[PDB]
Model the fold of this input.
Amino acid sequence: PKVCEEEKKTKTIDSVTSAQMLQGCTIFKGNLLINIRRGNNIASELENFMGLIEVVTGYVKIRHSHALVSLSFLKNLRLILGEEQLEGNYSFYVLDNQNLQQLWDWDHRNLTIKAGKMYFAFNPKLCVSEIYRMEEVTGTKGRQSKGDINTRNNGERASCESDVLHFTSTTTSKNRIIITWHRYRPPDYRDLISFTVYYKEAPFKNVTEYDGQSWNMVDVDLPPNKDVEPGILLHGLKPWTQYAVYVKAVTLTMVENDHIRGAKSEILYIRTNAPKTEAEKQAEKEEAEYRKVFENFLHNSIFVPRP
Amino acid sequence: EICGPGIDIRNDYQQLKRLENCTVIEGYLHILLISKAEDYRSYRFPKLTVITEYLLLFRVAGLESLGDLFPNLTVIRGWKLFYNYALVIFEMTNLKDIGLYNLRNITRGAIRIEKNADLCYLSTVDWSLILDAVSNNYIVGNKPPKECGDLCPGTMCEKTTINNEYNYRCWTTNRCQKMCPSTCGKRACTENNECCHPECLGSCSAPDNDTACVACRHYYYAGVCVPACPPNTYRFEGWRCVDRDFCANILSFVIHDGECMQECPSGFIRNGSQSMYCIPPKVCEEEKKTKTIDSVTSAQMLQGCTIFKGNLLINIRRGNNIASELENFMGLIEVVTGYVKIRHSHALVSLSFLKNLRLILGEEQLEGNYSFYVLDNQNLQQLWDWDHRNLTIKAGKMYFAFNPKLCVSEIYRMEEVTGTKGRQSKGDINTRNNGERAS
Amino acid sequence: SETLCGGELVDTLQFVCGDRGFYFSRPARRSRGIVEECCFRSCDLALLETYCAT
Ligand SMILES: *[C@@H]1O[C@H](CO)[C@@H](O)[C@H](O)[C@H]1NC(C)=O
Ligand SMILES: *[C@@H]1O[C@H](CO)[C@@H](O)[C@H](O)[C@H]1NC(C)=O
Ligand SMILES: *[C@@H]1O[C@H](CO)[C@@H](O)[C@H](O)[C@H]1NC(C)=O
Ligand SMILES: *[C@@H]1O[C@H](CO)[C@@H](O)[C@H](O)[C@H]1NC(C)=O
Done:
């Protein structure tokens, strides 16, 4: 137990070095105004300087903080009182976070927003399945309208649909692993640019994809023996250690963004027995689109129906 | 020996006999979908010398080089393009070498050569002698370079440099690419390097003589190349002048401004059956309900329009000068009805090519009533020279999101030019997704 | 069948047409491209047979 009361009511947080006053404390007897526009490594260090904060006697506001993909650096936060709250009675507020992918991990993080409601806008990747589950889980389901949690701008960019890539086979080894998944194809296979596989050490089965960005990424395409199942060998492993591994398909984006779902596996936990360039990242997406559109134009031009 | 109209050849090699007499194809040529691999070099065509539009080949099986079939193909003019291309060679399952050993200029447009899994000798061609705007050439998917095995005379072909690759340049294992000595300056030249006439293209039969030009730099008339159309004669499409009576005798045309046009421009009317002249609103419209603009060929359908009474979708991913060429095809459009939509159009830095636009009538709004809608466009730093425009959106409302370079002052300035004042919400014109990477 | 767009589309058109081959005659005006049928909306082998010569 250790309190964190402060001479400012609104402890704005613009940097890791601004959180220093909080390092080793729990109850922040005030309100917060997070404004972390840029930085790196910050999550591994905020989880030290404020990853024990447990209760906030007021509102939380989160503004322009494009530097962070998740709030899970608030590892311990169990409760927001809302004893001080914003205009419109918002006591949790998440605005214009250009890159916010998820809130806390709703598979085991409990929470409560006791005395107020919440607002979400313009967070473009934080799709509604992450926040309706917050209305459900954090004691606030009935408190606010769906203009406060708007449908249109929030989550527009993010690919929150999820065809599943079933693992067809797996193969442990003394220092290696090999895994395979079925012949997934979108409705028009040229949308599929490649697969990407994520793996990391995970001694406990509570891990999530949105760890700090921490995962290791490897890529593989659909094989040229198109009859055979996708698969990969990973050599970066060690004795007896347990790894999480999961696969995400990387796909084009078009006017079909409303229909190019992409795909994600479940996380599969496997224990061993006892690079790209960031330019080609986009350039091959352009190359495949600017090929696909010409090939469509060619087929529209070449063929005409018989009498 | 001037064949025409544009030829499409498909299904079987026996169709190629329709080329026996062609010296010039006044149109396109397609040679595509010859699945059968039935025959080889019994078919060869010494005559074919110029193609006025593009050449398209697709899925022609059993063809091993194109220079067995079309020798002497000195020029492709490209007067109309396929997509942006005067030459296309796509998924030619067996094409080894491009051939065309005597090809010496491509006038309009780029070339696209891709998926040709076995194609080599694309490195060894110095396109800068044959084409300009070579920045458009797209030669990506062919045989990987280490597998290519490109070697030729000397390795007796001249060395050349492009992109600091100073090396020999050649079309095939048997024969070089050769180009004129700078003694000719701009002008063409013979074999054994005699310099050709000024009004000559590709090659000539003899130096500096009217009758010797095998292909022509501007217009051919009466067996001789000339710089300009003679009086009492009229340009036909692309490359020749013709008699007025000929211009009246072709049937499935009107002389205007000295051209034998297919139709008289907007604001001019054909005075009956006339063909010797035409005298001072081409309301063009649906095939699909909308039109979508991926390419310069997509715009060619509008070249005479000036009211476009259908919905417009702009979609232009990439091209190095189409930011200008579209001023010809689209710049004369004065009213668009329906809606205007613009997305993924990463090639555009501006709308200024729509130089004459004045109304967006809102006749057939988007879902949500949007009559103007601008999404996901990279670049597009500026819409218009607003200081003198009028552009009123008669009905329906504007939308703007994900315009990373468009400063919102230019959008809020639209409401002083446009209307759309009491007709908006801040969910439509947000201060957040626009201009965050502006300068 | 469901939807076809790339090499699959030309391959199944060749398969269904076989030796009869493909029709062409330049229009000029058009309904919609073969992709807007067989790729985006719904393909039918009774329609793919109508682009063949017969
Ligand atoms: C998972 O469990 C371990 C042990 O309880 C713990 O150290 C870790 O913080 C938990 N959460 C994550 C995301 O690893
Ligand atoms: C070529 O010209 C000759 C002489 O006019 C004619 O008999 C023959 O049918 C022509 N062939 C073609 C393919 O046009
Ligand atoms: C091709 O011919 C045109 C017209 O004669 C000329 O402008 C062009 O420069 C020639 N080729 C190249 C590569 O410049
Ligand atoms: C929007 O358009 C629909 C028809 O597309 C029309 O009926 C309606 O009145 C318009 N205005 C709205 C929805 O506010």
